[PDB]
Amino acid sequence: PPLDELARTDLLLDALAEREEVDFADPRDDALAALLGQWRDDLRWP
Amino acid sequence: MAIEADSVTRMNELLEILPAKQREILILRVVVGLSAEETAAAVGSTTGAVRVAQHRALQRLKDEIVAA
Numbered sequence: 001p002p003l004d005e006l007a008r009t010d011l012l013l014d015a016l017a018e019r020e021e022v023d024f025a026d027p028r029d030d031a032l033a034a035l036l037g038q039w040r041d042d043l044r045w046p
Numbered sequence: 047m048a049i050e051a052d053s054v055t056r057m058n059e060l061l062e063i064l065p066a067k068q069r070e071i072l073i074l075r076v077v078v079g080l081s082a083e084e085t086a087a088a089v090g091s092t093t094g095a096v097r098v099a100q101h102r103a104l105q106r107l108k109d110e111i112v113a114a
Contacts, residue, residue: 014081039053
């Protein structure tokens with residue numbers, strides 16, 4: 001149900017935010033998460 | 047001879063596509079590391095609203111990646 005969509009994005013963003021490395025089935029997910037993590041890092045990086 | 051764009055130049059590119067509130071929300075959630083609620087407080091909306099906007103942003107982002 002669509003409601004689980006929301007919960008799942010929220011969880012992904014929470015993991016991104018804590019710098020937790022997650023392993024996705026779909027490689028494109030993997031790619032996007034990687035891209036966001038690097039970006040998260042650079043932008044935090046004073 | 048062209049330089050491969052860094053994560054930020056790239057991501058930045060993809061962010062310009064997003065509405066400004068969605069973009070603001072991804073930044074708070076990921077870069078600051080604010081929670082859904084905290085983000086809601088910092089942005090003036092409710093928690094449900096943030097949960098929807100951040101989801102839409104994520105999808106939008108997935109899409110834009112495809113093209114290219």
